[PDB]
Amino acid sequence: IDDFIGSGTEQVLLLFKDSLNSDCLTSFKITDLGKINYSSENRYLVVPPLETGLKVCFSSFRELRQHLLLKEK
Amino acid sequence: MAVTEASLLRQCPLLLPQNRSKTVYEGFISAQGRDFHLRIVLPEDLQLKNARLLCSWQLRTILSGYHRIVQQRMQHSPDLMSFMMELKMLLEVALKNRQELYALPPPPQFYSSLIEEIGTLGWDKLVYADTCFSTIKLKAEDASGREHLITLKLKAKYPAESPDYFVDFPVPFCASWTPQSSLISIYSQFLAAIESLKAFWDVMDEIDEKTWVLEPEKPPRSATARRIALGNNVSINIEVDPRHPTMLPECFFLGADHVVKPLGIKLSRNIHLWDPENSVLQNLKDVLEIDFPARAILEKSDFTMDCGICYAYQLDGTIPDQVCDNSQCGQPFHQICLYEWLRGLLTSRQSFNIIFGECPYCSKPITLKM
Amino acid sequence: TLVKILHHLEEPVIFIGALKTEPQPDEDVHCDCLVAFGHHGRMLAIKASWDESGKLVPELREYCLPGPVLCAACGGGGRVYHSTPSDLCVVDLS
Numbered sequence: 433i434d435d436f437i438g439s440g441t442e443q444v445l446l447l448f449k450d451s452l453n454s455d456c457l458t459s460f461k462i463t464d465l466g467k468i469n470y471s472s473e474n475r476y477l478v479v480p481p482l483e484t485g486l487k488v489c490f491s492s493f494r495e496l497r498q499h500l501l502l503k504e505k
Numbered sequence: 506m507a508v509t510e511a512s513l514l515r516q517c518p519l520l521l522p523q524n525r526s527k528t529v530y531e532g533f534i535s536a537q538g539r540d541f542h543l544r545i546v547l548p549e550d551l552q553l554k555n556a557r558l559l560c561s562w563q564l565r566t567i568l569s570g571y572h573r574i575v576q577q578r579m580q581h582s583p584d585l586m587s588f589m590m591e592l593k594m595l596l597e598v599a600l601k602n603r604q605e606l607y608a609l610p611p612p613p614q615f616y617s618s619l620i621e622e623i624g625t626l627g628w629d630k631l632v633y634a635d636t637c638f639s640t641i642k643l644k645a646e647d648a649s650g651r652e653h654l655i656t657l658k659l660k661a662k663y664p665a666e667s668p669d670y671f672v673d674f675p676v677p678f679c680a681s682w683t684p685q686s687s688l689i690s691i692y693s694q695f696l697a698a699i700e701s702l703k704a705f706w707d708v709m710d711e712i713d714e715k716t717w718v719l720e721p722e723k724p725p726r727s728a729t730a731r732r733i734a735l736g737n738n739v740s741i742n743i744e745v746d747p748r749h750p751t752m753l754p755e756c757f758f759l760g761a762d763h764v765v766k767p768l769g770i771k772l773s774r775n776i777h778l779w780d781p782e783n784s785v786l787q788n789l790k791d792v793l794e795i796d797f798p799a800r801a802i803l804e805k806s807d808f809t810m811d812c813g814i815c816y817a818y819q820l821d822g823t824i825p826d827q828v829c830d831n832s833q834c835g836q837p838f839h840q841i842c843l844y845e846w847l848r849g850l851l852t853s854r855q856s857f858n859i860i861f862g863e864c865p866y867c868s869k870p871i872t873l874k875m
Numbered sequence: 876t877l878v879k880i881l882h883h884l885e886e887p888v889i890f891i892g893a894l895k896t897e898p899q900p901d902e903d904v905h906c907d908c909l910v911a912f913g914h915h916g917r918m919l920a921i922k923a924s925w926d927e928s929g930k931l932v933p934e935l936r937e938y939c940l941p942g943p944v945l946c947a948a949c950g951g952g953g954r955v956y957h958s959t960p961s962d963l964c965v966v967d968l969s
């Protein structure tokens with residue numbers, strides 16, 4: 433588990449069995465479990481805005497909690 | 506009410522007198538679904554001539570650039586009632602001016618319903634959505650197989666009010682918005698407009714391919730005008746009615762006074778053979794008894810087809826348009842440049858929107874009609 | 876041998892800097908804006924207006940950006956790089 437691409441984000445490296453070859457790191461599998469996937473656009477269009485929506489909604493939530501403590505005071 | 510016992514309660518519900526002597530108010534003040542903290546100390550007597558007014562730092566931010574207005578209002582205003590009335594009305598001004606601070610989408614019926622509705626449309630339609638989810642841009646196809654886009658800009662409430670629709674085509678689009686109407690509804694309206702114009706699109710695309718369109722370049726879909734080139738250094742511009750495109754357009758020619766005469770004559774004699782069952786090009790070709798050039802670019806690449814005053818093609822939209830009535834010069838010009846020259850000469854005299862005088866290169870009579 | 880109070884964000888302060896908004900190489904750039912950050916992710920911005928009354932007025936904003944902000948810095952051309960325990964995000968004032 434580490435960043436082998438040099439994106440910043442961690443990836444998982446999976447090494448399949450040594451029965452294939454008497455050679456190290458042949459038969460690899462590199463994946464992020466999102467977009468990055470190496471080995472041996474309507475979908476990809478709507479996720480960032482929806483995530484930003486979640487973040488804005490989270491900010492509002494927290495703001496209202498603060499507003500409510502003020503009124504109690 | 507009349508008196509500031511009940512009228513004060515009715516118009517600042519959220520101000521609680523803290524002291525027995527109604528001297529220290531505290532609490533909240535309301536504006537645009539928003540309460541702001543506030544603690545408004547009077548003297549021993551009910552005098553705003555002298556009165557403290559302290560706030561939340563959130564409120565101080567929003568009353569920056571009004572501190573003088575507030576201080577004036579405290580001194581000039583009779584009672585506390587009217588003070589609060591004026592203060593609220595001033596907050597409505599402040600926030601409505603800084604309207605860019607707002608439009609927060611509600612979590613329950615926004616992000617979900619819009620995805621439901623886009624699912625109802627089809628995901629092949631959507632081409633863009635903004636990370637604020639404020640902007641979307643959507644696509645549709647002709648019977649011809651042509652892409653036409655539509656931008657919406659949407660508020661904190663999509664389904665309550667209309668979405669701001671920006672669409673290419675030249676005639677104004679009308680969208681019957683209800684709270685019950687939706688993306689498929691307004692999409693069906695767009696397709697309706699498309700299929701109605703279909704003829705218009707086909708006429709202007711047929712133009713763009715099969716003739717040397719000159720004075721729009723990379724034309725929009727809104728554009729009804731089409732300055733076509735024919736021969737060399739003479740042109741025809743053509744504004745066509747969208748609703749009746751195949752019908753005759755408003756038409757006229759630039760070019761050499763000795764070249765253009767016969768074209769006008771021939772157009773007048775053949776215009777009755779205009780027929781709205783053929784195409785624009787298929788009628789013009791047999792009306793004007795000619796063919797067009799398809800972009801004479803390679804041969805006359807650098808022939809000097811420029812103003813011959815400033816030596817430029819494209820002077821701020823302007824094209825070389827005005828020519829010499831002479832076989833030996835034929836020199837194109839610009840309106841602006843040839844006016845500025847001819848305005849000076851002692852030779853030149855002006856009629857109503859006309860300037861007479863000498864072609865710069867050959868010194869022969871040339872006429873300019875502004 | 877005096878000390879003046881500007882805004883008071885309610886939450887603790889993490890970064891203070893300055894930016895060049897409307898950037899229309901030199902090391903000393905004449906900075907148009909002023910920036911502060913909170914921990915809880917209130918941002919403050921300040922600007923000169925001279926608008927509507929024919930006189931200089933201080934334009935304050937006060938944004939609420941997500942997440943407990945852990946640190947930030949300023950990049951050339953009215954850009955601020957800031958960091959939350961989820962992601963490293965950016966803000967463009969220009």
Ligand SMILES: [Zn+2]
Pocket residue numbers: 829830831834835836864865866867868869
């Ligand atoms: Zn001439």
Ligand SMILES: [Zn+2]
Pocket residue numbers: 812814815816817820838839841842843
């Ligand atoms: Zn010119």
